[PDB]
From a paper:
Here we present a series of TIGR03971 SDR crystal structures from several mycobacterial species which contain an insertion in the primary sequence at the NAD cofactor binding site. These crystal structures demonstrate that the inserted protein residues almost completely cover the NAD cofactor, only leaving part of the nicotinamide ring exposed to solvent. NMR experiments did not show exchange of the NAD cofactor, whereas binding was demonstrated for a number of small molecules which could be potential substrates, products, inhibitors, or artificial redox partners. Experimental results are consistent with the notion that the SDR family enzymes linked by comparative genomics studies to mycofactocin do indeed keep their NAD tightly bound beneath a protein structure that may interact with a specialized adaptor machinery for redox exchange.
With the exception of the M. thermoresistibile target which did not contain NAD, all other mycobacterial SDR target crystal structures contained NAD, which appears to have co-purified with the protein after expression in E. coli. For each of these crystal structures, the adenosine mononucleotide portion of the cofactor binding site is enveloped by the inserted residues and only a portion of the nicotinamide ring appears open to solvent (see representative examples in Fig. 2A and B). In addition to the insertion loop which covers the adenosine portion of the cofactor, a second loop which typically contains two α-helices covers much of nicotinamide mononucleotide portion of the cofactor. In contrast, this loop is ordered in each of the mycobacterial SDR crystal structures presented here. The combination of the insertion loop which covers the adenosine portion of the cofactor and the ordering of the second loop which covers the nicotinamide mononucleotide portion of the cofactor results in a significant decrease in the solvent accessible surface area of the cofactor in the mycobacterial SDRs, relative to other NAD- and NADP-dependent dehydrogenases. Only a small portion of the nicotinamide ring appears available to solvent in each of these cases, indicating that the NAD cofactor is tightly bound and potentially non-exchangeable. The structures presented here have a cofactor solvent accessible surface area of approximately 18 Å2, whereas other NAD- or NADP-bound dehydrogenases have a cofactor solvent accessible surface area of 82–89 Å2. Given the encapsulation of the NAD cofactor by the two loops in mycobacterial SDRs, a large conformational change would be required to release the NADH cofactor after a redox reaction had occurred. Alternatively, these structural elements may not allow for exchange of bound NAD/NADH with free NAD/NADH.
Residue numbers in the entry:
A (entry chain B), B (entry chain D), C (entry chain A), D (entry chain C): 3 to 273
The structure:
Amino acid sequence: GKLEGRVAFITGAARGQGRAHAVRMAAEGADIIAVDIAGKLPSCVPYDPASPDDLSETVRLVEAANRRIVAAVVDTRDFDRLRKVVDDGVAALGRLDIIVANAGVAAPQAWDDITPEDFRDVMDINVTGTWNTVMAGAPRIIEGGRGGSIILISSAAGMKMQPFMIHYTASKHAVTGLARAFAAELGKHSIRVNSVHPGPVNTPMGSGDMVTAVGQAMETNPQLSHVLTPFLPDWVAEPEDIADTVCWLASDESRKVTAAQIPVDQGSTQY
Amino acid sequence: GKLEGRVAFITGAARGQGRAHAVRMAAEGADIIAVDIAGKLPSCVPYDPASPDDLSETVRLVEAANRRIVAAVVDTRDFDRLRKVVDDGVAALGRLDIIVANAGVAAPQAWDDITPEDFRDVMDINVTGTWNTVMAGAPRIIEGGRGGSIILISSAAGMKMQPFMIHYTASKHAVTGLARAFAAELGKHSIRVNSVHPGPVNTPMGSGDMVTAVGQAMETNPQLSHVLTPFLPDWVAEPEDIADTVCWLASDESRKVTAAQIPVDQGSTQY
Amino acid sequence: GKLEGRVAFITGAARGQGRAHAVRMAAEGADIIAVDIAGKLPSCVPYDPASPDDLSETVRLVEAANRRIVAAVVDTRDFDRLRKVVDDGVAALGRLDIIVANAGVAAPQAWDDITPEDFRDVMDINVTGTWNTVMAGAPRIIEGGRGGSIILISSAAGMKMQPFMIHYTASKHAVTGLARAFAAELGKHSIRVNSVHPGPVNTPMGSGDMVTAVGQAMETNPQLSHVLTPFLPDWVAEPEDIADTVCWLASDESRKVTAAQIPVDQGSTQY
Amino acid sequence: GKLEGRVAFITGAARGQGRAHAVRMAAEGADIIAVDIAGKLPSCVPYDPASPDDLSETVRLVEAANRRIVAAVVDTRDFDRLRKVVDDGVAALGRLDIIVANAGVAAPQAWDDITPEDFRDVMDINVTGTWNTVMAGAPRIIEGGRGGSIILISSAAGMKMQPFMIHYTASKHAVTGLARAFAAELGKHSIRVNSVHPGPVNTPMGSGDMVTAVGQAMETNPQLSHVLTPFLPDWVAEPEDIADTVCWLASDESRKVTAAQIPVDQGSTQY
Ligand SMILES: NC(=O)c1ccc[n+]([C@@H]2O[C@H](COP(=O)([O-])OP(=O)(O)OC[C@H]3O[C@@H](n4cnc5c(N)ncnc54)[C@H](O)[C@@H]3O)[C@@H](O)[C@H]2O)c1
Ligand SMILES: NC(=O)c1ccc[n+]([C@@H]2O[C@H](COP(=O)([O-])OP(=O)(O)OC[C@H]3O[C@@H](n4cnc5c(N)ncnc54)[C@H](O)[C@@H]3O)[C@@H](O)[C@H]2O)c1
Ligand SMILES: NC(=O)c1ccc[n+]([C@@H]2O[C@H](COP(=O)([O-])OP(=O)(O)OC[C@H]3O[C@@H](n4cnc5c(N)ncnc54)[C@H](O)[C@@H]3O)[C@@H](O)[C@H]2O)c1
Ligand SMILES: NC(=O)c1ccc[n+]([C@@H]2O[C@H](COP(=O)([O-])OP(=O)(O)OC[C@H]3O[C@@H](n4cnc5c(N)ncnc54)[C@H](O)[C@@H]3O)[C@@H](O)[C@H]2O)c1
């Protein structure tokens, strides 16, 4: 496997893309430190939350590949507990090489329906949770002295833009900034830091009231409806496609790639 | 003048570039709604704070140009107070056409010296404050039915990156995201939203211990010393050079320009 | 007048945007060196060519503003004649401060209908002609020892992309590269070099004949139909709108701005 | 073998990165159509040209990997010959899946030492040769009806800029544009088109008088010396590092990635 003997720390691992990364990296020989909030999301979020049962299933899948996994229910906004969990994982698994900062939320809203609390919540999770993840993981990669690879999941919205969520777009741009900023200062440790920018991905972020919320928002400005048009026939990527790119970024075959924005969007950022 | 009969809402107006904008737009015929925190900055900020007296001196300068000014001591993180101040100002001056979201802080710090507090404070002011500013002002532009122009002050850091301030670079990227996102949804009201990206500017953001904080950070990674190198002979722009660009963006001579990132950096973002 | 005493060299001056630059900079007090091919364009170009009479009309409009103007029929691909025309102009007018490299062509074609000759003709005009223009003018700017300002006209296509003209998008990207490259080496002379990226502009390039060509190419791929969608209500800028931006770039009010890509596209490059 | 049963068409295959792509893709199970000028380079080029013997050695290595290879000495500027070579290769090998447009030249020169001939030569090769490559291969990928993957080799210069080669920088931006424009019209055939942007690579592009040419150009503007500074400790990548990224883009593990600019530059485009 491409990641034999390695240990990856992955947030938002209970389902969707985060589960896809855990499962892919375990298959490549990595042991896993997996976290998810596994509970209530901000009230502007229209789809269903993840559950402790979801995270148990990620655990089951990773063990079925014969790898060790340390999993915990924790909010990426809770820096002290996140730091504690990472330290407990590393003590247990012996090292840390890879961070995937994947936990995030989306909430379609017309600009003038976004309350201060709404803005705060999305920014807190998508940016501060992302910064907390690097801050919990990086000193443990540095201590090993082997170099490493940190992948921050941004969005197509964080390279170009996405309409009907001012907070989300801001937050995903902030993630681009976090990648370039952490890349510059962590590069002397041979730690690569890169951001990944998916278009629409087939995950439970499409569940609950998402379709309705998107539908309602679009009505407020129909001129903005083609911002996510791809060049390929596909509008939607599978979580495995994102895991493909993130696996490559984790692997030694991207050892010279850092500070980069990697789109996996069937071309829509150039549309 | 290029802004006869217009009204501009300018944040961070007590000194530096914010004062230069007020003075420049006043000279152009605009009445002003000016706000500043005029007091203690986050503990990670190494330079000196502004005072209420700094804000009064901006008031004097604008009145000396024979223009009207409404001014208030207010934190851009305080949405409730900011909306009230804007609403009273617009009631007093008759309309709103222009927003310059200019209040911001900088703090040189090694990445591993940024506490959760420091990160939060820089993010809250540079992003949340910026968002609060548009939210308080844009409805007043809309109701006038004339279109208008909103300028968000980002940084070179928000187009490329700047080392030794993870929070700052992330926040200024977020500001790029705010300008594109607000441009997309407000465009139907004929409201332009653009961001401006200065390199170093000759302001009191250079005051107190800033040069010291800079050298101390630079010491942690000398390889990063040349990120801000210009193509022109000059490393530093004057606040009036930034006012030059923001005035163009406020004027009817940029009516078709929106969602843009305008650098004023002597070429450094391409260095 | 913002350009009193200055001299500007403008290509593609016979009509459209180039004429609007001449007229505007004349109104601001500059004398003008104006050239145009004023004759046949490559066969892939679907709209009507300019004529000697068109250039003569630009001359009269410039003379009407009480300015001096040296005008000549010349192909920007003709490096020797372009250099002599500049040299003659500078001998007559005393100096050179400003370059607007505006001459260019557009040709909608399905990717597989572009012949080698078509690709060559579009590249030669849009890239080599632009490069010849800088090589003919920049030595005379340097000679004066006053600094100066060079504006290359690219396109939204050269920031993002435009479908159905592989040559044109490539050429306009080359223009972004020319600007950054010349900015880097000419900056030591205090010569700024920037690129300007219009969306659709209301000029003879966008004639009926063009519309037909655009419709034909579009039929080959309907999904690519919304690449030029604006955030503002207007899809088309006026040539005066572009002249507003290029004038600001020529003026001392942008003395710190170099290597920049300035869009005038109502938001479309972020759509 | 990530590429069993596939056929890749690779230009500049006699040595350096082109040979590394041939060798790697053959190891991954692909058969090869390989071309190289294998002779005289433009006179502005300071390093050593390749020879027919170099190309024969590439043939030797692919054959030793137990793969089939069709190789020819041909200039990418020659559309007629290049197309005929591709056609003979596809008649022999059965199909075409992958294109690596890698043939390119570099020439350090102060801006005012670039002759019209130097400019045209660098442009014809890096841009027209690249376009000719796609035009010769893409119809063949289309006729197979299986989708495919086109990788254009640009440079870090084509994402940011590189000093002391106006032509080179312009050509590599043009390559960025080509990737986007072709991605747009070929995506309906499930053909991805992407560009790859290396920083310095350890190849014979460093041979002959390259070191001298670089040092001499640098003397004309010492301010520009740090444009290629990395965030990682290494300034230089190996051709295998680039082959890693091109291999990934050729593979099914980047099936949703198109119109992307992929830097392999240790972070220098964000420096
Ligand atoms: N789905 C898309 O179309 C799409 C497109 C672009 C980007 N993204 C981004 O990709 C990432 C993966 O999301 P997904 O599509 O797998 O959606 P998902 O909602 O199925 O997965 C996200 C997971 O993160 C967890 N999470 C959310 N907030 C958290 C917090 N504060 N602390 C800890 N865990 C938290 C959720 O419980 C959930 O398990 C997110 O960063 C998202 O913004 C998604
Ligand atoms: N000076 C530089 O080198 C530089 C470079 C790039 C960008 N910028 C940005 O330019 C903008 C203006 O900065 P400046 O150079 O004039 O520095 P400055 O400190 O002189 O002026 C900033 C002003 O904003 C005010 N302010 C700060 N936080 C506030 C808050 N929460 N609420 C209300 N007011 C607040 C301060 O009191 C101060 O008066 C900032 O956004 C800054 O980040 C500065
Ligand atoms: N009109 C648009 O929608 C649009 C959009 C983006 C960019 N542009 C760019 O704006 C610039 C000006 O174009 P325009 O809209 O005024 O169109 P236009 O055709 O009216 O003007 C272009 C002028 O340049 C001249 N010209 C063309 N090739 C020449 C050559 N080799 N040498 C000398 N002169 C030459 C033409 O004769 C014409 O007078 C061009 O670079 C064009 O690519 C136009
Ligand atoms: N070496 C670097 O530092 C570096 C950095 C960034 C990008 N690049 C780019 O990478 C690519 C590969 O170059 P390399 O580094 O392996 O150097 P190289 O000179 O060793 O390889 C280039 C090969 O292309 C061939 N070639 C050149 N022009 C040709 C033409 N018109 N027709 C056919 N073949 C031709 C040359 O003969 C040579 O064998 C080029 O596009 C180059 O511009 C190189």
